[PDB]
Amino acid sequence: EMLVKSKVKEFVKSVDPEMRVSPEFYDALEAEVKALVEKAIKRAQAEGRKTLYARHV
Amino acid sequence: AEMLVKSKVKEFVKSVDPEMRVSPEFYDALEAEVKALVEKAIKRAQAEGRKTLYARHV
Amino acid sequence: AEMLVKSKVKEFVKSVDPEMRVSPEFYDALEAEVKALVEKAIKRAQAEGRKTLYARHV
Amino acid sequence: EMLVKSKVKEFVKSVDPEMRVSPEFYDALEAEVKALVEKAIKRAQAEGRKTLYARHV
């Protein structure tokens, strides 16, 4: 798990004070973060690079 | 605030590509993209008139 | 099959960066990502039990 | 406009024959495609490239 659920909840509250987070949202968000990192790695590999940069995200 | 655990991101990267190193600013860029995903999810829920984020809003 | 007009993609790129050129493979990759965005929007609508795509599904 | 709305409609039908498309969906999809291309351009610029590749998408 790459996410801190309490910090996701706190961030959501900072955007919309009335917005709550379902337990299944955290799981779906975690899967999307994994997908972002896997895509970043594929961009770096396509370049022949062994370093991930901001521009690969 | 910061939603990601950088050590867990590093561990995940290693699980995909053992030889891949991570430039420090990648963690910050990944954090910004996760914030962007959550802000978009909030806009989807608000457009529906919901006060709860569901998996389908992501 | 193709949702994009390649000449219009090229024109848009030039409007953002006049010096930026477009490889043929970029158009194909962009087309695949647009299909992926629409498939994601369809899954959001289906999860909600809607039979219409709205702006908020994108 | 980069998208052909009739082709978007045809693609939606190919995925889900019962799914209808609101007029506002086409406009929202067009805005998201502009955002994808702007992000791709920023990735290429960050790399110091003057050509867009598949890996920039």
Which residues, 6+ apart, have CB-to-CB distance to A37 below 8 Å? A2, B9, B12, B13, B16, B30
Nearest CA-CA partner of D49 in C56, A41, C13: C13
Which residues, 6+ apart, have CB-to-CB distance to D3 below 8 Å? C3, C4, C5, C34, D26, D29, D30, D33
Contact B34 A29 (CB under 8 A): yes
Q: Say how far apart CA D4 and CA C1 lie, in whole Å.
A: 11
Tokens of B28: 């910050």
Q: What count of CB pairs under 8 Å joins B to C?
A: 16
Cβ-contact B14, A13 below 8 angstroms: no
Quote the Cα angle for A41-B42-D13, to 5°. Answer: 75
Q: Is C22 helix (H, G, I), strand (E, B) or coil?
A: strand
Cβ-contact D43, D56 below 8 angstroms: yes
Method: X-ray
Task: Output the CA torsion sign for D9, C34, D34, C55.
Answer: positive
Q: Say how far apart CA A57 and CA A37 lie, in whole Å.
A: 7
Q: Say how far apart CA B34 and CA C30 lie, in whole Å.
A: 22
Residues of C in contact with B48 (CB under 8 A): 48, 56
Amino acid present at C12: F
Residues in chain A: 57
Q: Is C21 helix (H, G, I), strand (E, B) or coil?
A: strand
C11-46 b/e (C-beta count within 10 Å ≥ 16 → b): ebbeeeeeebebeeebbebbbebbbebbeebbebbb
Question: How many helices (DSSP H) and strands (DSSP E) are in chain C?
Answer: 2, 2
Of C9, C26, C45, the CB nearest to D19: C45
Cβ-contact B11, B4 below 8 angstroms: no
The DSSP letter of residue D52 is E
The residue assigned the tokens 């062994």 is A50
Contact C54 D24 (CB under 8 A): yes
* CB-CB neighbours of D3 under 10 Å: 20
What would you report as the CA-atom Rg of chain C, rounded to the nearest whole angstrom?
A: 15
Q: Say how far apart CA B21 and CA B53 lie, in whole Å.
A: 34
* Residue-by-residue DSSP string for D1-25: --B-HHHHHHHHHHH-TT-EE-HHH
Tokens of A51: 């370093």
Tokens of B20: 């891949």
Residues paired with residue D52 on neighbouring β-strands, in sequence order: C22
Q: Say how far apart CA B30 and CA A35 lie, in whole Å.
A: 11
Q: Say how far apart CA D32 and CA C29 lie, in whole Å.
A: 15
Q: Say how far apart CA C41 and CA C29 lie, in whole Å.
A: 19
Q: Say how far apart CA D29 and CA C40 lie, in whole Å.
A: 12
- Region of residue A43 (left: phi > 0; alpha: psi -120 to 50; beta: else): alpha
Q: Quick one: which H or E segment has residue C24?
A: helix C24-48
Q: Is B7 exposed, middle or buried (0-12, 13-18, 19+ CB in 10 A)?
A: exposed
Residues of B in contact with C57 (CB under 8 A): 44
Amino acid present at D2: M
Amino acid present at C23: S
Residue B24, CA distances (Å) to A29, A51, B46 in order: 22, 10, 34
The DSSP letter of residue C4 is B
